[PDB]
Design a protein around this ligand. Structure first.
Ligand SMILES: CSc1ncc(Cl)c(Nc2ccc3c(c2)CC(=O)N3)n1
Ligand SMILES: CSc1ncc(Cl)c(Nc2ccc3c(c2)CC(=O)N3)n1
Ligand SMILES: [Cl-]
Ligand SMILES: [Cl-]
Ligand SMILES: [Cl-]
Ligand SMILES: [Cl-]
Lengths: 4, 123, 123, 4
């Protein structure tokens, strides 16, 4: 999971 | 403020290809010079400008069989159908002309672009 | 010896979400405490272990309406349906418990994992 | 396009  | 799962789109496409390989919920047959290819209308529309136009048509959206132009090569179509469901294109010296022509007909702009580039490198 | 188009899976998912937003070729209604959500069965199966099991069942594969367990929160479902079609999860302090519970019921393992991690960080 |  990432900060888009 | 959303978080994003990097592999989600790839995992979705992998599962859609698994459904295709097991012939689960396929809703159309694409006929290419008597060769038949089963697929999901939504995946075809998502990948191709031609299928997008066909299946948004109020009459054609209900067809279970679509016949392509007789000039379309079944191997070129098979390679492009595989690309639609996997992101992988089996581009070879022996098939590049048939793949580019099929991608132009199917309106798959990114495939047409790489074929044009690979052809330009060989000249 | 294939070449791969990096953005293909993301572009496919973006187009599938465009079809969902315009209600094109949606083939099922998911009912959650009287709230109704239209979707594509193949996308639901590709994202959820529960929908995969439902739509591979010889009787349920033909249903146009699926009713979820009354304990399922419609907002939690809406957030997860948005994630299915975009890879983006709108996870907030106020919805994390409902999102984790809905993801456990839907069998969306990666979503359950990030909810568990975010909850563990707050304790 | 890349070599996968
Ligand atoms: C344009 S809005 C839109 N909405 C939904 C879908 Cl399913 C869709 N597909 C589509 C249209 C045109 C093209 C492609 C896909 C691939 C390509 O090269 N051209 N387009
Ligand atoms: C297992 S083979 C397979 N073949 C095709 C599909 Cl459409 C599918 N979907 C699916 C199954 C289980 C789970 C998910 C999707 C997400 C998750 O967390 N668990 N699986
Ligand atoms: Cl027909
Ligand atoms: Cl393309
Ligand atoms: Cl029904
Ligand atoms: Cl998930």
């Amino acid at each position: 999971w990432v900060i888009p | 403020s959303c978080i994003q799962f990097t592999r989600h789109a790839s995992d979705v496409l992998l599962n859609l290809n698994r459904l295709r390989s097991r012939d689960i919920l396929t809703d159309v047959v694409i006929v290419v010079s008597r060769e038949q290819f089963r697929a999901h209308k939504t995946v075809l529309m998502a990948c191709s400008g031609l299928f997008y136009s066909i299946f948004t048509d109020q009459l054609k959206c209900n067809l279970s069989v679509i016949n392509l132009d007789p000039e379309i090569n079944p191997e070129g179509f098979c390679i492009l159908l595989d690309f639609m469901y996997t992101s992988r294109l089996n581009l070879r010296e022996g098939n590049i002309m048939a793949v580019m022509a099929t991608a132009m007909y199917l309106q798959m702009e990114h495939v047409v672009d790489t074929c044009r580039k690979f052809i330009k490198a060989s000249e």
